[PDB]
Amino acid sequence: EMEKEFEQIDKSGSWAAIYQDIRHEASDFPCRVAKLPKNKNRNRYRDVSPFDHSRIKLHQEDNDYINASLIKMEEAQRSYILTQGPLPNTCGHFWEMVWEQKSRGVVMLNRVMEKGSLKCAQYWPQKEEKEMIFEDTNLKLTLISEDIKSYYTVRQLELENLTTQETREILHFHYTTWPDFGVPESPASFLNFLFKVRESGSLSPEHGPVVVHCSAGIGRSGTFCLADTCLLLMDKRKDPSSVDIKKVLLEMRKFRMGLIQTADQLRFSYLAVIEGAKFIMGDSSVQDQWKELSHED
Ligand SMILES: CNC(=O)[C@H]1Cc2ccc(NS(=O)(=O)O)cc2CN1C(=O)OC(C)(C)C
Numbered sequence: 001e002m003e004k005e006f007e008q009i010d011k012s013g014s015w016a017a018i019y020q021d022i023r024h025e026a027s028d029f030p031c032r033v034a035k036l037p038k039n040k041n042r043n044r045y046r047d048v049s050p051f052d053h054s055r056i057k058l059h060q061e062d063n064d065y066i067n068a069s070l071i072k073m074e075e076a077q078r079s080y081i082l083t084q085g086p087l088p089n090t091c092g093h094f095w096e097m098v099w100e101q102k103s104r105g106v107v108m109l110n111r112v113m114e115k116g117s118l119k120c121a122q123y124w125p126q127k128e129e130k131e132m133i134f135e136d137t138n139l140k141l142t143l144i145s146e147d148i149k150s151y152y153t154v155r156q157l158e159l160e161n162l163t164t165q166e167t168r169e170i171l172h173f174h175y176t177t178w179p180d181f182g183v184p185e186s187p188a189s190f191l192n193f194l195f196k197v198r199e200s201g202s203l204s205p206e207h208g209p210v211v212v213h214c215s216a217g218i219g220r221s222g223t224f225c226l227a228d229t230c231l232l233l234m235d236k237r238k239d240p241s242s243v244d245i246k247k248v249l250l251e252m253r254k255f256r257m258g259l260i261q262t263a264d265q266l267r268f269s270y271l272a273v274i275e276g277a278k279f280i281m282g283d284s285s286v287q288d289q290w291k292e293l294s295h296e297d
Pocket residue numbers: 044045046048110180181214215216217218219220221261
């Protein structure tokens with residue numbers, strides 16, 4: 001049981017050792033496509049690649065490759081697409097993937113510039129009147145509106161397939177205060193934002209999988225998806241004790257390497273899940289309290 005386990009690990013001071021064991025046990029599958037010479041400039045990080053079995057394929061002829069993985073959680077019945085922050089030359093592929101996979105939401109857990117460097121291309125329009133055309137993929141993207149809170153911004157985007165003229169609303173949930181290789185400021189701020197994504201409907205099984213990215217699409221992204229699936233699992237069963245966090249993380253790691261990048265992101269994951277369980281088991285009030293503690297205004 002996660003809370004018993006949590007205190008035990010904290011008491012013994014062994015998050016590092018628990019975390020390294022997950023890395024030692026983690027799946028190792030091939031990434032032959034990611035490593036083809038022709039795809040070198042489609043990858044942000046040499047040592048962060050999608051496994052071939054789980055990679056999202058673009059529906060070109062030409063080159064179907066994008067650094068993106070379908071994390072398909074069978075028992076939870078939720079899927080997520082995890083991806084790197086798109087590069088200047090892969091922004092059209094990124095929106096092409098959103099369109100073909102029928103995603104309704106994109107969750108971005110990084111900033112475009114972190115520690116003085118460009119960790120993600122500016123892949124969405126910052127101004128209504130200056131829309132983006134991705135000519136390679138025949139798509140157009142327009143900012144419709146935004147709601148800026150203290151530490152996250154929600155945008156409404158309209159994506160248009162120029163070849164068909166069909167349009168879709170995409171919601172963009174941008175967490176702007178989660179440091180690279182870091183943890184959110186509190187369980188409350190992370191959970192306030194996670195429940196905003198949930199409330200939008202973007203995770204409904206009537207849509208394609210939500211797109212989740214940070215810079216590499218593994219650390220902050222893994223943390224977000226792990227907390228969510230753990231909460232979903234206990235919500236389905238109404239049974240917090242039936243969730244094994246480390247087993248869930250190992251299962252997700254069958255679909256993409258490196259998910260959760262530090263022992264403190266692991267420990268933060270347990271914090272978020274232990275706290276969010278209050279909500280799941282019927283303590284209505286904690287949602288307002290998270291919103292307050294997060295200081296979103
Ligand atoms: C340590 N650093 C690294 O391993 C790499 C890969 C990574 C993997 C994961 C990652 N975290 S996250 O997935 O964005 O939370 C950030 C980075 C940033 N990196 C880098 O900036 O390293 C580069 C490629 C820029 C030299």
